[PDB]
Design an enzyme around this catalytic site. Sequence first.
Site, PDB file in Angstrom:
ATOM      1  N   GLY A  43       0.798  -1.212   0.000  1.00 52.91           N
ATOM      2  CA  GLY A  43       0.000   0.000   0.000  1.00 52.91           C
ATOM      3  C   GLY A  43       0.833   1.266   0.000  1.00 52.91           C
ATOM      4  NE  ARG A  44      -0.374   2.988  -5.098  1.00 52.57           N
ATOM      5  CZ  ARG A  44      -0.356   1.731  -5.540  1.00 52.57           C
ATOM      6  NH1 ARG A  44       0.618   0.907  -5.164  1.00 52.57           N
ATOM      7  NH2 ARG A  44      -1.301   1.297  -6.369  1.00 52.57           N
ATOM      8  N   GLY A  45       0.505   5.762   0.957  1.00 50.83           N
ATOM      9  CA  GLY A  45      -0.287   6.820   1.566  1.00 50.83           C
ATOM     10  C   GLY A  45       0.469   8.131   1.614  1.00 50.83           C
ATOM     11  CB  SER A  48       4.722   5.365   4.944  1.00 52.34           C
ATOM     12  OG  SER A  48       3.410   4.886   5.222  1.00 52.34           O
ATOM     13  CD  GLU A  49       5.051   4.267  -2.358  1.00 52.95           C
ATOM     14  OE1 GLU A  49       5.459   3.171  -2.796  1.00 52.95           O
ATOM     15  OE2 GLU A  49       4.863   5.258  -3.091  1.00 52.95           O
ATOM     16  CB  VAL A  50       3.070  -0.472   3.757  1.00 55.79           C
ATOM     17  CG1 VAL A  50       3.261  -1.663   4.664  1.00 55.79           C
ATOM     18  CG2 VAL A  50       2.829   0.792   4.580  1.00 55.79           C
ATOM     19  CG  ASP A 153      -4.804   8.452  12.200  1.00 54.19           C
ATOM     20  OD1 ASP A 153      -5.955   8.841  11.922  1.00 54.19           O
ATOM     21  OD2 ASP A 153      -3.967   8.157  11.322  1.00 54.19           O
TER      22      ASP A 153
END
Length: 331
Positions: A43-45, A48-50, A153
């Site tokens: 994933g990506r946000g 960050s990217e995971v 969060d």
Amino acid sequence: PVPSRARVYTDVNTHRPREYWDYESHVVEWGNQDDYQLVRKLGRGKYSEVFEAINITNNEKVVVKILKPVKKKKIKREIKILENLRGGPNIITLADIVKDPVSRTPALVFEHVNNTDFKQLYQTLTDYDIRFYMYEILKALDYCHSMGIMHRDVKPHNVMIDHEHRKLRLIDWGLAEFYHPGQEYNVRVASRYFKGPELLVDYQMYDYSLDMWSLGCMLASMIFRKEPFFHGHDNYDQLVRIAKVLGTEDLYDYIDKYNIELDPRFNDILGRHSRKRWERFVHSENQHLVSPEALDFLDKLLRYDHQSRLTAREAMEHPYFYTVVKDQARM
Ligand SMILES: [Cl-]
């Protein structure tokens, strides 16, 4: 505006040595990125990217969060927070910290975690499973609160779950911070739908109890099968959607008690709204997910005054969880 102090774990950081929470002083001991190889992107946000990855020295599957560029103090904060919380129940476990060869950014290496989050299942759980996972999330919040940390969060996307192993992990501590009484905090935290009233009214002296509101929003969304439960279209409207449920009476009381300022033209828009009964949102579809215990619990979470919300420990003791704590761990 009147100052506020947490009702629980008030001085836990005070009673620890400064090294514990003084993350700007923390000296990072870097691990060696060469001991890990990235397998695939998960994933990506924004920050960050995971990646799925492998520890090549022993073939252990791990998960790697590569941070996008950010101020160093926020990176230090997340690292120190993660390190202080290692081996807390149901909290993602930081295994190593390395530097990204390319960007030179820090990358956080975590115990392997399933790539399914608590938004992909949680409109489909049984009544029993909602209680079950709710209790697992509470262990993580009591733990991190007890260690002087607000997550800030809490939301479905930030809880990973392995339903087949009935494991869950609270993740993404990039917004978390240490609680110190008298400290004023940024109110630009949490996703709009899980923002507590204190954030919506710019009250900065908040505490752990912010997480308890977000948790209530998740609970409401699950038992009423509405996502999100409080569906505001902007920051003001988020408070309006809330006030339409909890009523304006208790809201104005809250604002007064902390001497909060409310743009008076916003007040004209809020007007007055009746406190509705929770039973109002029950329908044939969600009937089986609702119960008296659930509504009482929800009611004690979703309160304007942050000081009045159940603590994580009080919530763990609520009748909503009476039976589910006897879970016999069938996979
Ligand atoms: Cl911040």
